[PDB]
Nucleic acid binder design. Structure first.
Ligand SMILES: [Mg+2]
Ligand code: NA
Length: 346
DNA sequence: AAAAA
DNA sequence: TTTTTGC
DNA sequence: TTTTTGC
DNA sequence: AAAAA
């Protein structure tokens, strides 16, 4: 019935097991900070498989037949079926390491290692951190502190629609033939997001594309609507977290009047530039979710003896690179039924 | 993957 | 070298 | 038991 | 922490 793979389950934003998944998300994040990568992912898969259920769990008889639920997970569910609360998750939420890790990493530029550095030093608040002379923050870390309250108050659908109008007009100006598609959470029909993602491709000067990202940003800097900027340069690809595509991580100023206190709002924007021939691979890889993508790869590997990434799909048996002009072709190659963006919310 | 430190 | 960034 | 768990 | 080899 139900598959252990996120790519073989239709997961919508209509969750009936929110009580359970919230508890499991906390328990995963707890093993994330302790670097217990195996345990972390176990709770990530249990929480993911539950978000796919077309009904709410009311009894233990309901869990039977559902994969990714072993002893530990079935007990979390057992604990919630009665109380209506998780004693495991309510414990983690009241832990100093966790509270501080969750807090510190919520800053743009701060991750696992820096949060652990600050916590070991004896820090617990972002205020005592900011008011220290002995410390030295990066260009990401300074921007993260500067626009904290605005980046922490996650983006909304009208705000994302204002950004997508601004990004398209600026990209359309320096390149008119280019197709610009909004990726990430907002492509999967989300209402709230941490950031706004985009994919840029034009059907195509090898020299012109390389200037595209710089053309649109410098143009936004001339208007002074570019608060933060960082650009990155562009077979059988593996052990590479982020793809080999040209890309940029920005913080842009969104004037209140463009979206239908101070008159502004800092918004996190990710732009990705890829060759036209890779459009399908890039879109699939940037739509997400995290759990859908990692399972797409895990499926290809373990079930199809193939190699999936954001650039291509390689069949090891037939020793050929399977091309695609759409997402539907990549799914068909993998022998997976099509799961449209809105149902990739794993 | 790149780019900062 | 080590850290951060992304779905 | 030992290995894998996403690029 | 769970499932496969
Ligand atoms: Mg996003
Ligand atoms: Na961060």
């Amino acid at each position: 019935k139900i598959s252990q793979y996120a790519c073989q389950r239709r997961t919508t934003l209509n969750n009936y097991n929110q009580l359970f998944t919230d508890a499991l998300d906390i328990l995963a994040e707890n093993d994330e900070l302790r670097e217990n990568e195996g345990s972390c992912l176990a709770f990530m898969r249990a929480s993911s498989v539950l978000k796919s259920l077309p009904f709410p769990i009311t009894s233990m008889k309901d869990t039977e037949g559902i994969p990714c639920l072993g002893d530990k997970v079935k007990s979390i569910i057992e604990g919630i079926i009665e109380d209506g609360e998780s004693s495991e998750a309510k414990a983690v939420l009241n832990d100093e390491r966790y509270k501080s890790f969750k807090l510190f990493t919520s800053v743009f530029g701060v991750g696992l290692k820096t949060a652990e550095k600050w916590f070991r030093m004896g820090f617990r608040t972002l205020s005592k951190i900011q008011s220290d002379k002995s410390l030295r923050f990066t260009q990401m870390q300074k921007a993260g502190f500067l626009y904290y309250e605005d980046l922490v108050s996650c983006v909304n659908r009208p705000e994302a629609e204002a950004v997508s109008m601004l990004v398209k007009e600026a990209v359309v100006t320096f390149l008119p033939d280019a197709l610009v598609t909004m990726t990430g959470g907002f492509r999967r029909g989300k209402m709230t997001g941490h950031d706004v993602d985009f994919l840029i491709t034009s059907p195509a000067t090898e020299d012109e594309e390389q200037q595209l990202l710089h053309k649109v940003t410098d143009f936004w800097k001339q208007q002074g609507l570019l608060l933060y900027c960082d650009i990155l340069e562009s077979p059988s690809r593996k052990v590479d977290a982020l793809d080999h595509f040209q890309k940029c991580f920005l913080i842009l100023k969104l004037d209140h009047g463009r979206v239908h206190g101070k008159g502004w709002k800092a918004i996190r924007v990710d732009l990705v530039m890829c060759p036209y021939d890779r459009r399908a691979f890039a879109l699939l890889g940037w739509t997400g979710s995290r759990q859908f993508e990692r399972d797409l790869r895990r499926y290809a590997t373990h079930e199809r003896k193939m190699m999936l990434d954001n650039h291509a799909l390689y069949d090891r048996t037939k020793r050929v690179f399977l091309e695609a002009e759409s997402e539907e072709e990549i799914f068909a190659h993998l022998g997976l039924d099509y799961i449209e963006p809105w149902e990739r919310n794993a």
